[PDB]
Design a protein around this ligand. Structure first.
Ligand SMILES: O=C1Cc2cc(Nc3nc(Cl)ncc3F)ccc2N1
Ligand SMILES: O=C1Cc2cc(Nc3nc(Cl)ncc3F)ccc2N1
Ligand SMILES: [Cl-]
Ligand SMILES: [Cl-]
Lengths: 124, 4, 124, 4
């Protein structure tokens, strides 16, 4: 087509979606990771994660307001990945990289799994 | 704005 | 912080949100623009438009599944802006610029209003 | 990935 494109649009959209999350506006699901609860927007979760895409395209699961993750999932790892979904920024540290990578494999977030593998390889 |  | 950032994340999120819209997945509102109907995600509309942000933060309107726009709004102008919300690309043409600018003013989409004003000024 |  002959469209023009606003470079910062996608980043500005994501910033606004994170502001809605902050303010608990139109959040429609609670993700439970053992004793912790995280409120989010199903569409943002599906857009970032192959696991959430599969869950919320299921004709029964699409209607659930609570999703319980596998008990082996680390709440801090999930929190770091949820923040990445809404900001593009990943708080990857020596102390959390193993939990973050395991969580990203489970959630099916291939680009995160990729940077974790690279950071681990560099320390070996 | 740019030409994509 | 000491975060790393994935450059293409925001664009990839928006591309996936547009794929959900295409496929009518988890759309939760119908926008009526006279005889036409457009299905969308409230969160994407709020993230792009000051008018939708005000509508869906209202304690009563947040619960509506149908929103009727002012009868003066042009359906093609709205369609072009809805596509821009989900793609960052604006199909601005000599034949639609007046309707697009009027619709963007109504929807409170300041960057679009800005490029329309500039394109109009260049033809004068 | 970059340093933002
Ligand atoms: O590593 C990843 C990230 C990821 C996100 C999605 N999300 C969607 N995919 C499509 Cl094709 N349309 C809409 C979506 F919301 C699916 C798989 C995967 N795998
Ligand atoms: O031209 C524009 C585009 C636009 C979008 C929004 N959206 C939101 N704003 C904030 Cl501060 N937090 C969350 C949001 F969804 C508000 C006003 C305006 N004016
Ligand atoms: Cl990813
Ligand atoms: Cl805009």
């Amino acid at each position: 087509d002959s469209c023009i494109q606003f470079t910062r649009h996608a980043s500005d959209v994501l910033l606004n979606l994170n502001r809605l999350r902050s303010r608990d506006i139109l959040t429609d699901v609670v993700i439970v990771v053992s004793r912790e609860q995280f409120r989010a927007h199903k569409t943002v979760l599906m857009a970032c994660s192959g696991l959430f895409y599969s869950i919320f395209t299921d004709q029964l699961k699409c209607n659930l307001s609570v999703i319980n993750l596998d008990p082996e999932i680390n709440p801090e790892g999930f929190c770091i990945l949820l923040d990445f979904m809404y900001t593009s920024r990943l708080n990857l540290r020596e102390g959390n990289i193993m939990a973050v990578m395991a969580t990203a494999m489970y959630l099916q977030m291939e680009h995160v799994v990729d940077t974790c593998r690279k950071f681990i390889k560099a320390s070996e | 704005w740019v030409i994509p």
